[PDB]
């Protein structure tokens, strides 16, 4: 089981506004900028 | 009519959480990663 | 002081509906497309 760690994980993914759910998208797309620079 | 076509647009798109509204944008960034890996 | 601009800035960013909060993520992806077309 992991019920208390699941509640914070749900908070960390996106339980209220924005979070990883959007910030996985913003950082990956940012990352392709400097990736074109160095690759 | 306007209300019926806007209703058909919202059901097919993103009436509720996430949908093609996030999935169409997020899968296109996913597609470039592996594009570099295999190119 | 700063209030008339700031309230405008927040409504420009995102109060209700899409705005720069979805336009930074979306236009950044739509950037990678022409990137690849010209590279």
From Swiss-Prot, chains A, B, C:
Membrane-crossing residue ranges in chain numbering: 21-39
Region (MPER): 1-19
Glycosylated residues (UniProt): 10
Top-level taxonomic group: Viruses
Membrane topology: Single-pass type I membrane protein
UniProt subcellular location: Virion membrane; Host cell membrane; Host endosome membrane
Function: Acts as a class I viral fusion protein. Under the current model, the protein has at least 3 conformational states: pre-fusion native state, pre-hairpin intermediate state, and post-fusion hairpin state. During fusion of viral and target intracellular membranes, the coiled coil regions (heptad repeats) assume a trimer-of-hairpins structure, positioning the fusion peptide in close proximity to the C-terminal region of the ectodomain. The formation of this structure appears to drive apposition and subsequent fusion of viral and target cell membranes.
Subunit: The mature envelope protein (Env) consists of a homotrimer of non-covalently associated gp120-gp41 heterodimers. The resulting complex protrudes from the virus surface as a spike. There seems to be as few as 10 spikes on the average virion.
Name of the featured protein: Transmembrane protein gp41
Organism name: Human immunodeficiency virus type 1 group M subtype B (isolate HXB2)
Whole-protein residues included: 665 to 703 of 856
């Amino acid at each position: 089981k992991w019920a208390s760690l699941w509640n914070w994980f749900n908070i960390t993914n996106w339980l209220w506004y924005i979070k990883l759910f959007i910030m996985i998208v913003g950082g990956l797309v940012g990352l392709r900028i400097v990736f074109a620079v160095l690759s």
